[PDB]
Ligand binder design. Sequence first.
Ligand SMILES: [Zn+2]
Lengths: 87, 223
Amino acid sequence: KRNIPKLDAQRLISERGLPALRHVFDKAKFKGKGHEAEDLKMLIRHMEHWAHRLFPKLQFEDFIDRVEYLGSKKEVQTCLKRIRLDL
Amino acid sequence: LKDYALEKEKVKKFLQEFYQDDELGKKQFKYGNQLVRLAHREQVALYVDLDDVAEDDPELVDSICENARRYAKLFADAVQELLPQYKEREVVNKDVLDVYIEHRLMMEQPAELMRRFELYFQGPSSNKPRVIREVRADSVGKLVTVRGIVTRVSEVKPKMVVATYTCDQCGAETYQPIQSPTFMPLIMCPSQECQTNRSGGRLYLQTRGSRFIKFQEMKMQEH
DNA sequence: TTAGAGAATTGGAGAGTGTGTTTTTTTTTTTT
DNA sequence: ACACACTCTCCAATTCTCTAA
Ligand SMILES: [Zn+2]
């Protein structure tokens, strides 16, 4: 009863979080000099798409606030050390 | 009560083995030929004649005449189970509703949605016609024959048989078979992903996917 | 200096209760 | 049998406080 879903640290370090992020951009392409605006649009498009995988309930700005707060926890640092360099 | 599985096998045996000394006595097994035509989508309705059944099993005829609705469902399922055996050919795509079904198959790879045939009984020759005054309450549920004059007829209307919905978020589809004269539609997605995440996706009904049948109303009066 | 555990207050997710809902006979004025 | 309006409850989210890393 009352099994309310919410985005906590264990969910954030799951596969649809940072691992999926690490792999989403290796297929993308960017145009660079004089096209930075379009590259930003493409980047944000993929980022909103990815965020919706992780927790499809919040608006994107509210989701960013949750990630900004939740980034403080040691649990995500234990995964960050793997995402940076390698496992 | 009878075991309707045994009755199903008996009905299958009738369809598989009966020949009326048919096609000028050449014994070409009328219902087998009909099943070929049905499998190749040459024909839609199939009128099973109870006089043919009486040649093998009059007790089955009596079983059908009372509580006919059970045997309607039973014969329909038997025909659906036997249909692939009389198929040999691939049929051309010719209907938008079946284009949706084809897409559904392509994506997958209830039966009511696919069951594109109709099954009806032709009354036994023993049963003389009643007048509209002699169909009293002891005949509820039983197969009857009536005689009279038509007074009024409506236009042909589309009657709903099974509804098909799509979900905005998860991209899945859902089905709802209809039997009563009224129903209540669905609203919010019951699929596990939407439910577990409580994501709140809504359901949109698709007239391109759902199944409809021709329906008409009529009145008949005493001589 | 930065972060986690134990205790107190409060929002709201959810359940329960009460109630509502064409077709016939007779008269009166004015047209005939 | 199927919809509003109202009352009420228990579960657990948010912050205070004390503590260790
Ligand atoms: Zn859904």
